Symmetry: C2
Subunit: 236 residues, 2 copies
Amino acid sequence: SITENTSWNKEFSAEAVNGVFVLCKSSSKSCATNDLARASKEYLPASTFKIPNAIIGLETGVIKNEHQVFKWERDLTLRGAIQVSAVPVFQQIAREVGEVRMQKYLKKFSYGNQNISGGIDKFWLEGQLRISAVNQVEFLESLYLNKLSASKENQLIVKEALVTEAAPEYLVHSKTGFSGVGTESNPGVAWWVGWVEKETEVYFFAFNMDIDNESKLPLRKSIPTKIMESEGIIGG
Amino acid sequence: ITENTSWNKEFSAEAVNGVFVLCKSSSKSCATNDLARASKEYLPASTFKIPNAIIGLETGVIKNEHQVFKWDGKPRAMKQWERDLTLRGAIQVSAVPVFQQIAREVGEVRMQKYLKKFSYGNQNISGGIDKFWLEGQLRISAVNQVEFLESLYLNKLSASKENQLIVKEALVTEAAPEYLVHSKTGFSGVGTESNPGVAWWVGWVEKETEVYFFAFNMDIDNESKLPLRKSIPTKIMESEGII
């Protein structure tokens, strides 16, 4: 069940932006958001698509194993290619997977509008593919639980590649995305999605915002952090 | 495996008797400050949580990656262990009573089998099923730790690849887009001035597309010197440009 917390709008206003945050404790049955309408609106996933693309890459055999090196401006591991800008790597993966297989996996994953038109190597960046913050949480929860239609091994491999913060009792798996800086009337979209394991609890999250100014990009992390901090998740 | 006498500099200041073993790419290319001590076997103390976790998973004693080890509200030796812990948490805070109970459930026969498969030190689990790695006769060298960890990195242990991956994520301690560290500390206790305890730091570092396996141990008779198990090897690694 998802509920609306309009008091969270203060954190978007303060900084002057239009966006949404979805935060779920334990499971996607217990979620809250600043804006119910926008929580279900679908946007270009941009680099958040590397999550399903890597899983599909591994399942189809296009990516050999966790230790494959993607050789070149620099050579990258799977983790490095996900965490850094590595355009050509994932373009090459998508072309190798192919449209029929890509379409079949997005069906199995219930990934957004499942519309991959616009070119096999750019549909998630300039094409027709769209996904909501709610659908991102649902997808990430399935991954967490090894419930996607993929081997547990491959789900595990991608999950370690997504670790971004680590402490003994606090672990964060996450991924950013950004379609580009658009204009005030035709803004781009920026994302931060993932999950936080704090002690024995887990929190799934998905954030997106409209971006029409290059200087606003860091808000994709700061706004969610501030909201999570207010919920008591960050530290004590 | 060559010996690097220049690395002794890092141990000289603190009068530390210890050894560091560092291997670039594979265990076929290693360096150490003390060739003799590199193969000398010591109590693994909490570094044993690595094989123990894998064995707990393989035998079904540990259900999966999301198992919660519930605290019963009864006193534990460390306040940091007095709470519900995940598998990763229990490893990271080195929650001894959690792993003692795992060991009991695994049992002597299964434990012996897996230590043989894993080529784990002297494979001597005498001393009581819940204390052999802490005060018993089990002994492993720094070189053996590097061999074992490399197997784990490569998914080559005789355990499911899923289970090896689960334990690998539980060992992550430092994360960045192109830098990742998997590691585990150990500390047997302070022994005596005459028969000192041992402290350990073991693990591996992924930097860009390279991997480095490492194991450190030292004699310890004063708990105040404990951070040197991380600081000495960190200084050696940073001086080699592993940062």
